[model samples]
Target: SLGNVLLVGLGAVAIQVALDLRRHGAGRLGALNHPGRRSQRIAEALARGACLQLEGQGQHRWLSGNAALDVFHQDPAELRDDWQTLVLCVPADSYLDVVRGLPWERLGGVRTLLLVSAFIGANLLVRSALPAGCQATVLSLSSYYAATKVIDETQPLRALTKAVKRRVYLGSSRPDCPARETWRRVLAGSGVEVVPLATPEAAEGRNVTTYVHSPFFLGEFALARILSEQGPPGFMYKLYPEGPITPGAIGAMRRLWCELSELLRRMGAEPLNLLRFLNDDNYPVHETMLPRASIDGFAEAGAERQEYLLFVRYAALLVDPFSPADEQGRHFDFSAVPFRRVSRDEDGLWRLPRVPLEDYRKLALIVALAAHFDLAMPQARSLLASYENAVSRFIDCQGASQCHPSLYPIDSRPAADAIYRQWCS
Candidate 1:
């Protein structure tokens, strides 16, 4: 009786896509994962109501669970005769074996054969293996960074939008990228449905710091910097975590920071430049650093230490750079700010530095510009105007309170007051 069903892997991509499909009105859903560590994780996620867990793993047991609906599993040969579609969410390496084992006759009612891996080469293999008459839709779930970069260098956002005729889903462990709406509009104009997935509620208490935190930093600082300096139509950059960080998290953090620093440098800037802005004298760098240092100060911050650092890094990035300047001033005067001094030289000059708050504000403006320009020139202009309005309103509020929280709070507040001030005044 169901319209469509999905058999997903146990990876984050699979979990996110499954949740998103459920939200979009897919009638029946089933998830498949390797029966080892992955199965355990899947079971935990299902326990939390983040995803629907099928009764069993592998062919016979999985097929037995849903006799009425078409089942898509890793091994296509095991598909029940009555099933309508078989979506392969396996890795590129294992795709061919699964495809070769598929029963062609059972595929008669299948509307589309979908491959969720991002490897183009795997897509070609699927195309070759698929039967001639069957409706085959080759789709890949790529990271937002990859998609955005492709849009920036090559075709107009509209053209790429057209190529991805099917629904395009954006998934991240972060809350949600603010630019997601803009992406949806541009892609929608080109006939593509852009769906975004925030971290599932199940993932709420669990620490996904290593997997999710780095992108937040880049999204906040590096991505914004790119948009500001590179001209309109922001380029998308992908976020990839190299391996499990459970045992050697410190090593992982160091490597990640080094790679991110290098990546920013390649784009003609420094990673510390952003960090400096966040930590320098003029901003709440002291206030922010206090909690951070306390958490990590005592040499042993527990198994989640790296994750705690990653959270701080993400917090720094997610902040709205422009809000600080609007609420406070162009430059933060941290000369009088109090903090346990980290360093002092022989000359007795206070070495406390106010983070470069202005640069981050500028960085925020750039991200807004890039997101807007990607939509259309008009949208770009509108975004800039909105940002200006936000800055104005923030200034007004800061004056009233005589306090500046952080740039992020200011940036995120609704912009109605700023927009009105811009137009009416």
Candidate 2:
């Protein structure tokens, strides 16, 4: 049996995961969400027997009948104590807080704990957070299975999956954990592929966004538009004057990757080949642009060669090379993903988009890891400084009372050191 599974987030990803698990014969499934407006909205929708619609491949499939899921609005500390498996779909930065609020005494019976998305050292952090003698097996994935979004706030329980990743990495706290195989079976026919690594940190390192997003979002052009009310609309992935993907910014991204690769090397782990990962695991381009031989040889190439390949990798993705051309012979505008600006919530608090907000939280972990190894990640540090400086200015101008707490800098070194003692020592 897969055991009774509890998904601790009500977002689109969690909904999809819940449905998939139920379809795969997982034991009873329950959903948990933060006690807020969104949670209430979903709970009411469920009371009306709301259905989750998954739109993909030109079909609208509703998860109704036996695929129906239940949501609990009670506090984690007060909820039923029968859950044997817990899947945390929440942000990694909130893991500590979320776990701290859970009924650990009851969770002592948990057989497996899963983090759907995580940063480096997540296994170490989560393991340490568990109570002494708790033997639950912890698993971490590089990221969620797909890009899903709520269809509308009014229809809170419905979600649309935009894109599914071709592959993602997985890591387990123990070598012989059976949950690894169970998960592989869960996603067997789900289209998304899972590659399990020998160590959790290795899987964590597979996330390409950790190395590239900081530089892409912290640039002067990106920050000016993200923080201010001026400037015309721009795409997130376009090159040069159109977006943040300039030569200097791409160089910064290369340096960030090099810094992370060196950090992984010092820890006695093999670092990923940036170009190869981008091509095979993420979106692919024409063979003429990136040959198989060049992609395969990326790991052993020189710095200049590697950087040039990275530049070409982005250039090749400027448009959807495989999409059919229109009457004007223009392919799909694949790079037209717009940057999300800061906005105000219904509760009147300022909200920053995930681009820099989530990126900032993950960068905090990288900064701590580099510091723990006594290495200077100059590129990472520079980008972090730029973000902090920009956020500080934005806060000073916008006032801090209603600004989101994540807009401020956080020191994750203490937590990093704790995990280091468990993993390194």
Candidate 3:
């Protein structure tokens, strides 16, 4: 039996987490994502190299990633054999539907459930849906922005705590500086408890966003906690460093910030200074400056936490329009990055960086979806272009290339058998 388990969305963080878990003695790991070219690429990446075999063995399983929650309609016994813990790394909006759709009877055997930072509400929803006899412990790590909002004294930590406690015990990564501390104190007053992060000695001189430190720290803490449990049902929470923010969310956040700034000015309060509040060297330098006043409002109002987080996140989207990370952070980034053109191979198959063929596949199912749905045509193309432009700022922050490579590769013969076998289902 594996000591730790994960339910992941297709993305970089999932790949990183899977590798890390293996290194930490996690046995028999399984990764599930919505079926698509992107998911397939992720699975292929994991299966191909030293990374996949590092610490624990993993099997990249396929599932429907549709926001519709259709995967749970399948037989759980067949979908997953036995898992002691489940780490959810899916999108926030799709989270509840997936939880509600879970085959709890099959999962009753699980010991722990770890909810990554973004799906805070999902964690609560899962906790509420569990049967009284279900002994699983629910745990979560809030997004950095979410953490900021929760910790800020002006916000309602108690309501958040109460809402979250109904689902799982909460955990938080230590804020990096004194301002964050002030925010944490505010959150503490609201009944939210922040967990101190175990900083690695190797990380002493490195930048906070470098490599996978944050998510690894959160994942490591989670593995330790879950393994320490005595019976069936425990949980852990964790976070990762922020990547690009989404454009739509970023635009909304900016509008909100402008409104908040005007209001603060009207009230004769110190104008919320964007530069002063967000000028931390650690924060990614982007062309657009997010209004600090809006973030301040988010920190103070606990009830508005979700909307605020979504707004700020989407505001980041305004900067990097196409990257899911711009709006959703790392977890979403994990799901979206595989779509970037660099992952494709010369033979028309998508490949992960530095991975071998026996393990990774070159096929991109998302490309197929676009093709099948005629995404290149005017109507669909126009819609997608608009969405992409909305998050362009955030995408730029991540250094996404303006000209993404074609989904298909050069001098390639279509693998009709493989395509039908893998993506057509």
Indicate which candidate wins on TM-score: 2
Find the 10 residues in a row with the least total lDDT in model 2.
57-66
Could you give candidate 2's per-residue lDDT for residues 1-425 as a string of tens digits? 56788888777777778767876887777777888888888888888887554554333244322356654644786667677888998887887777778878776668888988878777778887788878788898888877888789898867777667889888899885668778877765467798888777788888867877878998777877677656675778888788888888888988888888887777655789888888989988777888889999987888788778878888888899999999999999899888888888776767788887888878878788778888889888889888888889999998898787778768888788878876764
- Model 3 CA RMSD to the hidden true structure, in angstroms: 20.5
Question: What ordering of candidates by lDDT runs from best to worst?
Answer: 2, 1, 3
Cα deviation at 361, candidate 3, in Å, is 31
* Residue 238 Cα positional deviation in candidate 3, in Å, after optimal superposition: 32
Give lDDT per model, in order: 0.35, 0.79, 0.34
C-alpha-based local distance difference test score of model 1: 0.35
Superior candidate under lDDT, 1 versus 2 = 2
lDDT of 3 by residue, 1-425 (tens): 33536455534334333433443345466655666655554444444431222111122112101111112212233555367766666544345446666677767667666555432122334555566677675544443222111222222111111121111113322223222232234234323344322221111111121111212211222222222223322211112123222333233333334333343233222333232233322232233434445444543544345344434443443333333454435423221221111232444433222211100111121122224333332322232233334234323443344323321122212322232232223
**lDDT (Cα) of model 3:** 0.34
The CA lDDT at 256 in model 1 is 40
Please, what are the lDDT tens digits per residue for candidate 1 over residues 258-334? 43334323322223322222233123334464354543342344435544554454333333333457454543332
